[PDB]
Design a protein around this ligand. Structure first.
Ligand code: A1BAB
Length: 167
């Protein structure tokens, strides 16, 4: 039993809600919140900008030190950093940005990172300003993640579309 509230069960291990991941994190303080990151951990907009702003830019400061030491992530890759005031940990996961010309097959690789964590609060990877088909992202999530994932989808209209079209 966990403290996630009001989620619609989709499969054995995947749950979904129409919510801002930042607000879900502020309320639940999960062990792991997933950021929809880019390879440079430059948290400008979307999920990343919203999470970072909620940390008063501490996420960005920590991320800049990470990159200075380790260099960029891979598309499809991840790193674990602090969750600051939002969660114990933040799993920064890089889904392909098809507006940047990146390979959609890497979306499965991106979701595989979730399997290293028993429970996660996560956004829909590669959706939104990352440009991919959100129905596709949800399908890849369900078919790839085996651990318990609570998906927060900000946009009400797309949430309604995601639920109504889910197979
Ligand atoms: O609603 C669309 C959804 N954005 C969010 N989902 C949940 N909490 C959120 N809080 C702020 C935004 C946001 C998709 C998922 C990945 C991504 C990256 C950039 C923009 C949009 C998106």
């Amino acid at each position: 039993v966990n403290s996630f509230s009001g989620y619609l069960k989709l499969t054995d291990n995947v749950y979904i809600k129409n919510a801002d991941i930042v607000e879900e994190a502020k309320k639940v303080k999960p062990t792991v919140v997933v950021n929809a990151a880019n390879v440079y951990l430059k948290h400008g907009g979307g999920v990343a900008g919203a999470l970072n702003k909620a940390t008063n830019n501490a996420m960005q400061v920590e991320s800049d030190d990470y990159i200075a030491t380790n260099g960029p992530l891979k598309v499809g890759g991840s790193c674990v950093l602090s969750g600051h005031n939002l969660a114990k940990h933040c799993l920064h996961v890089v889904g392909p940005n098809v507006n940047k010309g990146e390979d959609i097959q890497l979306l499965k690789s991106a979701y595989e990172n979730f399997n290293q964590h028993e429970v996660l609060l996560a956004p829909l990877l590669s959706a939104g300003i990352f440009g991919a088909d959100p129905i596709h992202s949800l399908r890849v999530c369900v078919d790839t993640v085996r651990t318990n994932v609570y998906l927060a989808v900000f946009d009400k209209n797309l949430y309604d579309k995601l639920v109504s079209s889910f197979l």
